[PDB]
Amino acid sequence: ADISRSEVATLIQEAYANDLLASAKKGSTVLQAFPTVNMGTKTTHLPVLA
Amino acid sequence: ADISRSEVATLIQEAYANDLLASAKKGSTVLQAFPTVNMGTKTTHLPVLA
């Protein structure tokens, strides 16, 4: 006669840890690479020589 | 001749009182009868003797 881990049941609580949870978020490439403009309205016109 | 109650009209006004509704509502029988566990998440494990 002896006491097994299964015979102790839920007197032994399983633990939790968030170590693996976090992942670094990545931004748009095009917002890093190119000059941006702050728009005040839906549409902006930019003339070019053609 | 005489001024009756109806001839005085809305100078006499009715009153309101909630004494018939001012009664404690009926609680749960099992929350009165049995002890309780303050759970923090969907599931709790309780060991029992076997």
Coordinates of C-alpha atoms in Angstrom, one line a residue:
Chain A
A1 CA 0.0 0.0 0.0
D2 CA 1.3 3.5 -1.0
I3 CA 0.1 6.8 -2.4
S4 CA 0.6 7.4 -6.2
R5 CA 0.6 10.9 -8.0
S6 CA -2.8 9.9 -9.5
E7 CA -4.2 9.0 -6.1
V8 CA -3.4 12.6 -4.9
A9 CA -5.6 14.0 -7.7
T10 CA -6.1 17.8 -7.8
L11 CA -4.3 18.5 -4.5
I12 CA -1.3 19.0 -7.0
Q13 CA -2.2 22.1 -9.0
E14 CA -0.9 22.6 -12.6
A15 CA 0.9 26.0 -13.0
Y16 CA 0.9 28.6 -15.8
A17 CA 3.6 30.9 -17.3
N18 CA 3.5 33.6 -20.0
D19 CA 7.2 33.4 -21.0
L20 CA 6.5 32.0 -24.5
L21 CA 3.4 34.2 -25.1
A22 CA 4.9 37.5 -26.2
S23 CA 5.9 38.1 -29.8
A24 CA 7.3 41.3 -31.3
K25 CA 4.9 43.2 -33.7
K26 CA 6.1 44.3 -37.1
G27 CA 5.3 47.6 -38.8
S28 CA 4.7 48.4 -42.5
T29 CA 7.9 48.3 -44.6
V30 CA 6.6 51.1 -46.8
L31 CA 6.1 53.5 -43.9
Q32 CA 9.8 53.0 -43.0
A33 CA 11.1 53.1 -46.5
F34 CA 9.3 56.1 -48.2
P35 CA 8.6 59.8 -47.4
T36 CA 5.0 60.1 -46.0
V37 CA 2.5 63.0 -46.2
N38 CA -0.2 64.0 -43.7
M39 CA -3.4 64.2 -45.7
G40 CA -6.3 66.5 -44.5
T41 CA -8.9 65.3 -47.0
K42 CA -9.6 62.1 -49.2
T43 CA -7.8 63.3 -52.3
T44 CA -4.5 65.3 -53.1
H45 CA -3.3 66.3 -56.6
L46 CA 0.4 66.1 -57.4
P47 CA 1.4 67.5 -60.9
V48 CA 4.3 65.9 -62.7
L49 CA 6.0 66.8 -66.0
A50 CA 4.7 64.4 -68.7
Chain B
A1 CA -75.7 76.5 -3.2
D2 CA -72.7 74.3 -2.4
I3 CA -69.1 73.5 -3.6
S4 CA -68.7 69.7 -3.9
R5 CA -65.4 67.7 -4.3
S6 CA -65.8 67.3 -8.1
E7 CA -66.4 71.0 -8.5
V8 CA -63.0 71.7 -6.9
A9 CA -61.3 69.7 -9.7
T10 CA -57.5 69.2 -9.8
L11 CA -57.0 71.6 -6.8
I12 CA -57.2 68.3 -4.8
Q13 CA -54.7 65.9 -6.3
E14 CA -54.0 62.2 -5.8
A15 CA -51.0 60.8 -3.9
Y16 CA -48.6 57.9 -4.9
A17 CA -46.9 55.4 -2.6
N18 CA -44.9 52.2 -3.4
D19 CA -45.5 50.4 0.0
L20 CA -47.0 47.3 -1.7
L21 CA -43.9 47.0 -4.0
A22 CA -41.4 48.0 -1.2
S23 CA -40.7 44.4 -0.2
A24 CA -37.5 42.4 -0.3
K25 CA -37.3 40.2 -3.4
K26 CA -36.9 36.4 -2.9
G27 CA -33.3 35.2 -2.9
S28 CA -32.0 31.8 -4.1
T29 CA -32.7 29.0 -1.7
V30 CA -29.3 27.2 -2.4
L31 CA -27.3 30.5 -1.8
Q32 CA -29.1 30.7 1.6
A33 CA -28.6 27.0 2.4
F34 CA -25.0 26.1 1.2
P35 CA -21.5 27.6 1.6
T36 CA -20.0 29.3 -1.5
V37 CA -16.7 29.5 -3.5
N38 CA -15.6 32.8 -5.0
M39 CA -14.4 31.6 -8.5
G40 CA -12.0 33.8 -10.6
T41 CA -12.2 31.8 -13.9
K42 CA -14.5 29.3 -15.8
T43 CA -13.3 26.2 -13.9
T44 CA -12.1 25.2 -10.4
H45 CA -10.9 21.8 -9.3
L46 CA -11.9 20.5 -5.8
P47 CA -10.2 17.4 -4.4
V48 CA -12.5 15.1 -2.4
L49 CA -11.5 12.1 -0.2
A50 CA -11.7 8.7 -2.0

